[PDB]
């Protein structure tokens, strides 16, 4: 039985290898791919799941819309346009750009044009979603979380049947962008608590915690290599110049001597949530700090002292760990979705 | 010479009055109605906005759109009819079908969507040679929200509201005023957008618009000839809070607040304005909303103008004001009729 | 029946005058005066605060403290006289020995420290058989300095503060008062320590309190039979900021803020009291010292009362102000003579 | 040649340590101790330290001062009384409490009696001190900084004389008491704020990237009871029960086998500076903060990255490590002293 699911992303690297993931596993069945503003622009980030599609031979089969530019109540932290940074860096997309094909979200829309793609386009596609689901719909979330805030902002009855696994935040280890929080959360922190305060079922699936734990070793690369180039050289090439992109900075920044893979983790969380740990508490998040808007706040500590004596209901689920097995499972899975992008392409 | 428009309100007494001033008025040509949560949710606004059309026989005429039921980022204050005075059970059984519903291609009222209005206002603001005029007399949610979807188009609108308090103390909490408290970060958002943003009825000059009893029987006189069911509905509504406004307020004499606003857009000679930059307070504990300017500074003399305020209306705008509502209100007296 | 007193202020014209209304007031029996930083530097309001005592042959009698250098958690306001209009050259050469110095056993000024006069007021407060009043006009670092070192002696202080606007906006910021936003911490922790505290004279009275022509004649018929010289000062002083609060602040006559306070100590049936419980605003961006209360809540029906607020004076209220400050007046240039 | 200096302390089990070594270091010449509000009040902290230096046989030569009772700006976290907590749990003070001989402070200020002590009383003497420092003086401080930040409003010309080395705040990993901060600081985080703007010389010489690795393992104890079980069997039972008194806490809440001992750290690094990793950096304490208050947030991480293009001036000295042989150095150190306490209590 497949899983219907809505990805909400920026990439972005990470994004990419979660879009490859979500797409070519059999267990999720991709409604939409909706972007979002992040270190780059929405629009940037629009071609890149564009690309990324074009590339995985998926782009004439999977709606992409094109969401919000900035953060509900404070300023995108996305570089000019005259920086000329693609977001993707490390291949050439240019061959992928010119034989890309039409857009299907364009004809769900009634639009001629991708010029015409506003931020609540996806509002009614995954409200049609919701309204169908027998529990709750899906949506996996690995970048900042406007877009779905302001859907929710649109939809505030539907928060009840909506269950979001994102790649977000930072708990029992410090943050990365800024001292002790997370990218994805610190660049929209209102949008975060607002999905927390609204009636989402929400899990922490990816926090650096565990993302920091699934880093791209020598072994990872051979296997890589194993699975792909017999199939595909120039795809292989590709997935590791891509994998590779920031392994620098992740090492002379952030001391990485393997840099880490983030978002396919939230992914993988709902494809195989068994090889997670996981522990319900109440999250709150920073946003009146000057230097720690952001912070994943949990009551996680009062529980172990003091479990009865809890204010605050439980409003999210936390992985802080992957399970015996657990990586070699994510490996595995990882790989063979790229064995088999490997033989598509050809 | 007339003014393509919008409005974006919270019915509200107060809205009403503005409402009817715009659309009766041939100055301005409503091109819809929005509304926005307040005191009382967006679903009751948005009847009481189609309740005023109704009274006033264009209902048929006017598409009127249910916006957002929250703030930003903050908790709605709405309860638990929004239009206390009068008995509305007719209206709304004679309410006529809602014209947005065609423009959207809905079949009923149940399938309105926040985000409804987008579509049209970006219509507007591309058509508009210089920029598009909305009238803004409730929680600025709406456009702030609209301006996160449409940030391209905010150097094209211009905004008339009623908002905020600068040179007197405010209502609904020590120093700030309700529209901007409800939803801070939205008039925020505006502020930093790009639109050319007004402050044409502050408290300032709300506080010094009141319902007197010459004002009573000057509308008696220029309605009662053609409806006095329309008289007495008009007067229970403005003295429907006189008491709560004297007792809790100091008011021997009630203010009338959002359709100063309109009156901006239909004859801004009557206002004096000053050019200044405005912050609202968002991070304070019991200051949020409070609009905080450089005004003193400029007196004395660095962060840029992004804002005109009103802070007064000049020798005779009372009576021009008067005499524009009265002129209104006796022309819906003559549809209405006995 | 005269009460014992401390002053604690920032000379600065308008405590000049309060604490000449003080000492000269049999009423009042003043047992030391604290200085805080303000505008200028806590060593400019110490040599401020002598000044004024050495002006009216007092600087031999009253104990004078030099306070807080600054806020409790935020940066001075303070600039590179703070008493301008006059010239202090002969008062500064002929001023006598600080009182103080004995006090503490020091052999000079510059072994004066901030927290000098906290002993003395222990003592005083020990020694009360209520509670011990203090009256304070500029920013309150040094009491809730005091607090933090001696917090079981809140119970047993009085304060009446020139400070804080409530019904009226404020001066230096767009909805604050000086002396609470240059430390509004400070002012916060003393509301929760206990302190019985009193807004004797926030803006909402002393803009009432106005030096007009007729204040001026009345104080040239008191001084000038005595002393022409002491008649030129005082009346140079209260009119050096005259031309700014008129072009900055539209007064056509200026205030005279902190002797309100002072007064109410001495006559508190000229003013009208109510009891809220008012929140200082400490994280407000734009808003910081904003004196919020929860008075507006009362009129319509949970926080514990926290304070008493003077909202005006009583009717004869202004009139016996003068009649009090003109007398002082009086008896001091007597004193000074020819 | 012996560095004079003052502790300001709140004992606490870990403070009880970093005095026993302070004190009987002859490379410390400790003036005076001053106690802060903590855990428990400040006159309990007072009476501990007094307990302290009556069991090692110094409280008749080194005066105490009992300072302030709470926050400059925020509410004391003190147990109320009437809990019965002294601070210093595990052990039986009555014989300690009754021996306890006059203390010196009192005819240095010359009053008849404790209950006659005042906050600022400590102020005179740090001024004697600073005043008559060649270069700068030192404060070790390992608890709340209120203290600290008391005296410099009131002597503010003194901070440019004053350097501190403190037991305080976290960097690279989380915090204890709350989320991403430490006690130390969120107890006051507005007195540290102060106090790095003052002028003040600012090591955090042990945060808890430093104290979580110096933890009192089975190896300890027994170098412990060899040194101090000879010489006086009570003591070492006391001095154990001391050190485990919150292990099971440390082990159930916080996933310590062995328990950290925070303070002695501190003292340490103005002993012997040279086992320490030193960078400076521009350090922001979070103030405003509603869950994230007393967060020490670095500029570490721009430095990385674009050294000259950074903006504000290094305001601290940061210890993120021990180097190689400093944790052996340490235990050295303190295993001495206890010995040496050991010999002179018999
Ligand atoms: C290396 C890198 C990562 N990211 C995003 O940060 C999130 C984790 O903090 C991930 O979703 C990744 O896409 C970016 O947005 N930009 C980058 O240059
Ligand atoms: C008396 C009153 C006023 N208002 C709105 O407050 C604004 C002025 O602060 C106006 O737009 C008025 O509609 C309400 O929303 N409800 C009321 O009961
Ligand atoms: C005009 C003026 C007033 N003040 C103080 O402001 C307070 C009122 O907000 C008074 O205590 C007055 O001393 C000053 O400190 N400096 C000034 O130049
Ligand atoms: C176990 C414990 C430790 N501490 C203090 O926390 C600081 C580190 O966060 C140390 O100075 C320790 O004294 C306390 O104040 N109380 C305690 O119960
Ligand atoms: O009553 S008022 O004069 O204020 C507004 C009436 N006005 C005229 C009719 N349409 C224009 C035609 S269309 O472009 O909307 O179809 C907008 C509404
Ligand atoms: O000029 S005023 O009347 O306002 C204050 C004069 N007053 C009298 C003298 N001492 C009391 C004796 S002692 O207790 O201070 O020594 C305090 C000062
Ligand atoms: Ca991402
Ligand atoms: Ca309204
Ligand atoms: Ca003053
Ligand atoms: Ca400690
Ligand atoms: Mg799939
Ligand atoms: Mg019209
Ligand atoms: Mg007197
Ligand atoms: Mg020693
Ligand atoms: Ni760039
Ligand atoms: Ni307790």
């Given at each position: 039985?497949?899983?219907?699911?809505?990805?909400?992303?920026?990439?972005?690297?990470?994004?990419?290898?979660?879009?490859?993931?979500?797409?070519?596993?059999?267990?999720?069945?991709?409604?939409?791919?909706?972007?979002?503003?992040?270190?780059?622009?929405?629009?940037?980030?629009?071609?890149?799941?564009?690309?990324?599609?074009?590339?995985?031979?998926?782009?004439?089969?999977?709606?992409?819309?094109?969401?919000?530019?900035?953060?509900?109540?404070?300023?995108?932290?996305?570089?000019?346009?005259?920086?000329?940074?693609?977001?993707?860096?490390?291949?050439?997309?240019?061959?992928?750009?010119?034989?890309?094909?039409?857009?299907?979200?364009?004809?769900?829309?009634?639009?001629?044009?991708?010029?015409?793609?506003?931020?609540?386009?996806?509002?009614?596609?995954?409200?049609?979603?919701?309204?169908?689901?027998?529990?709750?719909?899906?949506?996996?979330?690995?970048?900042?979380?406007?877009?779905?805030?302001?859907?929710?902002?649109?939809?505030?009855?539907?928060?009840?049947?909506?269950?979001?696994?994102?790649?977000?935040?930072?708990?029992?280890?410090?943050?990365?962008?800024?001292?002790?929080?997370?990218?994805?959360?610190?660049?929209?922190?209102?949008?975060?608590?607002?999905?927390?305060?609204?009636?989402?079922?929400?899990?922490?699936?990816?926090?650096?915690?565990?993302?920091?734990?699934?880093?791209?070793?020598?072994?990872?690369?051979?296997?890589?290599?194993?699975?792909?180039?017999?199939?595909?050289?120039?795809?292989?090439?590709?997935?590791?110049?891509?994998?590779?992109?920031?392994?620098?900075?992740?090492?002379?920044?952030?001391?990485?001597?393997?840099?880490?893979?983030?978002?396919?983790?939230?992914?993988?969380?709902?494809?195989?949530?068994?090889?997670?740990?996981?522990?319900?508490?109440?999250?709150?998040?920073?946003?009146?700090?000057?230097?720690?808007?952001?912070?994943?706040?949990?009551?996680?500590?009062?529980?172990?002292?003091?479990?009865?004596?809890?204010?605050?209901?439980?409003?999210?689920?936390?992985?802080?760990?992957?399970?015996?097995?657990?990586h070699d499972a994510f490996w595995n899975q990882?790989?063979?979705?790229?064995?088999?992008?490997?033989?598509?392409?050809?």
């Amino acid at each position: 039985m497949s899983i219907k699911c809505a990805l909400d992303c920026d990439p972005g690297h990470d994004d990419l290898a979660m879009i490859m993931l979500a797409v070519y596993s059999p267990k999720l069945d991709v409604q939409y791919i909706s972007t979002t503003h992040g270190n780059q622009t929405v629009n940037k980030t629009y071609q890149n799941a564009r690309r990324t599609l074009n590339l995985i031979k998926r782009a004439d089969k999977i709606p992409v819309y094109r969401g919000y530019s900035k953060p509900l109540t404070r300023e995108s932290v996305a570089c000019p346009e005259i920086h000329g940074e693609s977001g993707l860096g490390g291949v050439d997309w240019s061959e992928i750009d010119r034989t890309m094909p039409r857009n299907p979200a364009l004809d769900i829309l009634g639009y001629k044009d991708e010029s015409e793609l506003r931020p609540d386009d996806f509002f009614k596609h995954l409200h049609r979603l919701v309204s169908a689901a027998e529990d709750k719909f899906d949506i996996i979330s690995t970048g900042s979380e406007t877009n779905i805030a302001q859907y929710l902002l649109a939809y505030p009855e539907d928060a009840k049947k909506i269950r979001m696994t994102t790649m977000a935040g930072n708990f029992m280890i410090v943050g990365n962008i800024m001292p002790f929080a997370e990218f994805n959360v610190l660049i929209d922190p209102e949008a975060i608590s607002n999905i927390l305060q609204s009636g989402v079922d929400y899990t922490f699936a990816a926090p650096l915690d565990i993302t920091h734990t699934v880093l791209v070793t020598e072994k990872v690369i051979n296997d890589i290599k194993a699975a792909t180039e017999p199939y595909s050289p120039k795809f292989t090439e590709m997935i590791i110049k891509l994998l590779f992109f920031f392994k620098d900075t992740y090492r002379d920044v952030f001391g990485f001597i393997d840099p880490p893979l983030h978002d396919p983790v939230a992914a993988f969380h709902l494809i195989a949530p068994e090889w997670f740990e996981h522990v319900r508490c109440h999250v709150d998040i920073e946003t009146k700090g000057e230097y720690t808007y952001g912070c994943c706040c949990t009551n996680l500590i009062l529980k172990k002292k003091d479990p009865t004596k809890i204010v605050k209901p439980d409003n999210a689920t936390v992985c802080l760990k992957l399970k015996e097995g657990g990586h070699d499972a994510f490996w595995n899975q990882m790989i063979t979705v790229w064995g088999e992008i490997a033989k598509e392409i050809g």
